[PDB]
Structure 1
Amino acid sequence: MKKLTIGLIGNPNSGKTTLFNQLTGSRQRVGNWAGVTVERKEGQFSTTDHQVTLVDLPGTYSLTTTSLDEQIACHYILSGDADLLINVVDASNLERNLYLTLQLLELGIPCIVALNMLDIAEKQNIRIEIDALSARLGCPVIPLVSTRGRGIEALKLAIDRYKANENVELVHYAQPLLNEADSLAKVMPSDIPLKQRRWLGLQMLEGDIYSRAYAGEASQHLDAALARLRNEMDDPALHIADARYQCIAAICDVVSNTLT
């Protein structure tokens, strides 16, 4: 029977392991990711409507390439096996944790954010405006309330309702970066979704070596693209990164408040 396949992804020590264990109970298996020694855990659970296979991805700060854990995560996410992702986000380290989230959203893969460590955040005098965050991300943000399994039940509701992320304005990259990324995208393997081709383009311009492997013929055009960009601006690779952090910072200014 065909399952609904969900990738579980987050930063190291984000609560992702405990969530995995809570969802799957005894219904889990362990092996290794193909060709490496890194453990691959997956398990099963059900919602009202769906039988789910949950694949636990290694903890990572980003999808950018350098730990195996990060390339494994990226490779799975680009493989297209998952129908959606649950992104476990530490509320007590929101700004840091959102770097990964933004990468997932830019790839356009359907996401649900599971917001964890709400107790820690409160104790650090931080309240998160959950709907304000969901609005800026374009995806559901579910608070993982521990009391009486409420968070888990809300997460399962969200799974039964999962949909494409909204086309919110996210990172606002300089137009030359977008132009060059799109020209690379045009050359890449046609069967790769356009969003992902464009993301790959930007990763290659940032200097991500692994992204080149996906990009087929595009990799031959990257030096010419970088030459143009270097003429147009100071440190194009840093402009890519700075756009991302600016975006995150602007979200967090609204969403994360003092509790006092």
Structure 2
Amino acid sequence: MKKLTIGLIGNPNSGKTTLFNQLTGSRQRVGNWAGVTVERKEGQFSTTDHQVTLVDLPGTYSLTTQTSLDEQIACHYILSGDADLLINVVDASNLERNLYLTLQLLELGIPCIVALNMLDIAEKQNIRIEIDALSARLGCPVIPLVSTRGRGIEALKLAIDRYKANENVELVHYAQPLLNEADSLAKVMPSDIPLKQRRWLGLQMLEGDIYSRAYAGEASQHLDAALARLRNEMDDPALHIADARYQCIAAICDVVSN
């Protein structure tokens, strides 16, 4: 039977293993990622409507590439198109740090559900999150979990059964020239890669990500000239990409967290 395929992704020590184990139980297998010794781990569970294959991905701060294997493994999987959606396990006690990865996933346009974990930890650090406010800004569902107790697991399963395209909201606000160059690069990348993904790959190349150049086909030959123009228009275009992301996250966090 064709199963619904979900990628489980989050920072290290966010409750991803614990969430995975509560969801799949004994119904899991362990192997290795193709051509490396890093453990690949997946399992099974059901919701009301769906039979799910849950693929645990290695913990990572980001999808940007002495960049660990975990990170390239996670990014390569997200970019494959194998998953129908992702569950982004976010540690509510370190929200701003954890949202770097979330934004990366949201800019790629993959259907996403945020599992907001470590809520008790947030609580007793005197922080609470405005959950719908965060959902409104992310353009995707935000489901609160205390996953060691199994709290919100039913609500997470309910959200899987309602999965749909993220709201294509504006997130990071890049200077227009960076967007114009990302688009020029996008235009000449392989036609079968979705547009949002080609535009993401383009911004990553401009930022200095080397792995991304391998997806970009002949965009790779145009990159030096794109960077020549931007250096004439601004100080450190790559730093501007980065600050744009961090401004975005910080502004979200100001409103959502207290």
The CA deviation at 1:146 is: 5.0
DSSP 3-state at the match of 2:143: strand
Contact 2:47-2:161 within 8 A present in 1 as well: yes
Cα distance in structure 2, aligned partners of 1:36 and 1:167: 36
Aligned to 2:51: 51
Aligned to 1:60: 60
Contact 2:117-2:147 within 8 A present in 1 as well: no
Compare 147-156 and 70-79 and name the one that shifted more. 147-156
Contact 2:22-2:150 within 8 A present in 1 as well: no
| 1:36–1:18 Cα change, 3 Å | same
Q: 1:45-80: per-residue Cα shift (whole Å, max 9, x none)?
A: 000000000000000000000100000000000000
Cα distance in structure 2, aligned partners of 1:246 and 1:148: 34
Q: 1:154-200: per-residue Cα shift (whole Å, max 9, x none)?
A: 00000000000001110000000000000000000000000000000
The CA deviation at 1:148 is: 6.8
Cα distance in structure 1, aligned partners of 2:235 and 2:127: 37
Contact 2:60-2:71 within 8 A present in 1 as well: yes
| 1:197–1:88 Cα change, 3 Å | same
| 1:147–1:8 Cα change, 3 Å | closer
The CA deviation at 1:203 is: 0.1
DSSP 3-state at the match of 1:104: helix
Cα distance in structure 2, aligned partners of 1:131 and 1:68: 34
TM-score normalised per structure 1: 0.98
| 1:204–1:82 Cα change, 3 Å | same
Cα distance in structure 1, aligned partners of 2:37 and 2:230: 39
Aligned to 1:33: 33
Cα distance in structure 2, aligned partners of 1:245 and 1:225: 23
Alignment of 1:1-260 (within 5 A): 1-65=1-65, 66-146=67-147, 149-257=150-258
Across the aligned residues of Structure 1 and Structure 2, the Cα RMSD in angstroms comes to: 0.9
Contact 2:183-2:202 within 8 A present in 1 as well: yes
Cα distance in structure 2, aligned partners of 1:146 and 1:207: 37
| 1:100–1:27 Cα change, 3 Å | same
The CA deviation at 1:145 is: 3.8
The CA deviation at 1:150 is: 4.0
Cα distance in structure 2, aligned partners of 1:244 and 1:170: 9
Cα distance in structure 2, aligned partners of 1:215 and 1:122: 44
TM-score normalised per structure 2: 0.98
DSSP 3-state at the match of 1:218: helix
DSSP 3-state at the match of 2:43: strand
The CA deviation at 1:149 is: 3.6
The CA deviation at 1:242 is: 0.2
Cα distance in structure 2, aligned partners of 1:113 and 1:146: 13
Q: For structure 2, list consecutive stretches of 5 or more residues without a partner in the other structure.
A: none
Contact 2:10-2:101 within 8 A present in 1 as well: yes
Compare 146-155 and 69-78 and name the one that shifted more. 146-155
DSSP 3-state at the match of 1:53: strand
DSSP 3-state at the match of 2:203: helix
Identity, in percent, stands at 100
Equivalenced residues, count: 257
DSSP 3-state at the match of 2:21: helix
The CA deviation at 1:232 is: 0.5
Cα distance in structure 1, aligned partners of 2:219 and 2:188: 5
